[PDB]
Amino acid sequence: SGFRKMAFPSGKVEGCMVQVTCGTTTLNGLWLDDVVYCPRHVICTSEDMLNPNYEDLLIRKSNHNFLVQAGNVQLRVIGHSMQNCVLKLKVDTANPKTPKYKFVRIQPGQTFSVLACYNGSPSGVYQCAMRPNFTIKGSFLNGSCGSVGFNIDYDCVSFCYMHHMELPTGVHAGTDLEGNFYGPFVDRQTAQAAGTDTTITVNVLAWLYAAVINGDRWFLNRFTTTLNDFNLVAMKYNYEPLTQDHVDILGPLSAQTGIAVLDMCASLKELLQNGMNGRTILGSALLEDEFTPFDVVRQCSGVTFQ
């Protein structure tokens, strides 16, 4: 028992981090086979970033412009190319530590693990979710660009996130590993608003099933409710609509615990409408939404990866 914000084992990814240096700029890159992936604003200079023409800035540059460092070993660029917002440097050496991987583009509500990096050396790993507004509340400092988010399935690393920029409010924006931003943000240094967020409802219900699996039960009641009456209350508390699909996803969690999904909904209703009165759920005084129903199944059962 116990429940923790748990991140995938980061080993498979650590073997792919490199330092990428163009001009006066230095950021992180992801090295898979003979290709290194990094943000395209590695080619921006300082007085560029206000409105740069990347296509144009890149045709000015040559291969020897890109200092790629793989540990203390200088990797040789033999080609470059842009793809949406990511740069791709093709190098002479293939990375022998290349795991079986995939590039996947995730939906808001999905969680992943971030390996925060500086000069291609890992600093830490932590668990994030993609917020309904395509921001993520990460922990990133200068030089953290090109750190990646990922999920691990058996022996496969699903890459889903690369880091690019910090938004005035201190949240973070980034791209998939083909270079398409999440949300409406751009790698230009003009004003950009995150957009108002909501609470990932399906996930708070998943976390309440984790609590019940763990002996916390003070919050279940006899009351039931309907999706409609439940979605009318969520909106006031600015949660996200619960679909027929979320009810379905939460099926095995309901079956493991004997609480009908819609019974757990009327329990969240009462929580939003009455607070917590000093009580806490899984060691938390807030309603917690960065756990998927997949996260709860995996942690509360014992699924590993090879």
Partner touching 90 among a second copy, ligand A1ART, none, CB below 5 to 8 Å by kind: none
Q: Kindly provide the residue ranges of all beta strands, DSSP E only, lying in 56-110, ordered along the sequence.
A: 66-69, 74-75, 77-83, 86-91, 100-103
> Rule CB under 6 A: which residues touch ligand A1ART?
27, 41, 49, 140-145, 165-167, 172, 187, 189, 191-192
Query: Which residue bears the tokens 């009327």?
Result: 266
What b/e string do you get for 205-233 counting C-beta neighbours within 10 Å, with b at 16 or more? bbbbbbbbbeebeebbeeeebebeebbeb
Q: Provide, rounded to whole angstroms, the least separation between the CB of residue 119 and ligand A1ART.
A: 11
Residue with tokens 């949300």: 183
- Annotated catalytic residue 145: yes
Q: For residues 80 and 172, which CB has a smaller minimum distance to a second copy in the complex?
A: 172
Q: How deeply is 61 buried, as exposed, middle or buried, from its count of CB atoms within 10 A (0-12, 13-18, 19+)?
A: middle
41 is catalytic: yes
Query: In terms of DSSP bridges, do strands 156-166 and 100-103 run parallel, antiparallel, or are they unpaired?
Result: parallel
Query: Closest separation between CB of residue 4 and a second copy, Å?
Result: 4
The closest residue (CB) to ligand A1ART is 145
How many residues comprise the chain? 306
Q: Which stretch binds a second copy (CB under 8 A): 59-67, 78-86, 114-122, 192-200?
A: 114-122
The one catalytic residue among 41, 163, 164, 172? 41
Does residue number 273 form part of the binding site for a second copy (CB under 8 A)?
no
Identify the burial level of 191 via C-beta atoms within 10 angstroms of its C-beta, where 0-12 means exposed, 13-18 middle and 19 or more buried: exposed
- Please, what is the minimum distance in Å from the beta carbon of residue 82 to ligand A1ART? 14
Q: How far apart are CA 247 and CA 261, in angstroms?
A: 6
Residue 277 binds which entry of a second copy, ligand A1ART, none, CB below 5-8 Å type-dependent: none
Shortest Å distance, C-beta 260 to a second copy: 26
The active-site residue out of 38, 85, 117, 145 is 145
Footprint of a second copy (CB under 8 A): 1-11, 14-15, 71, 115-119, 121-126, 128, 137-144, 166, 170-172, 214-215, 280, 283-286, 298-306
Task: Return the active site residues.
Answer: 41, 145
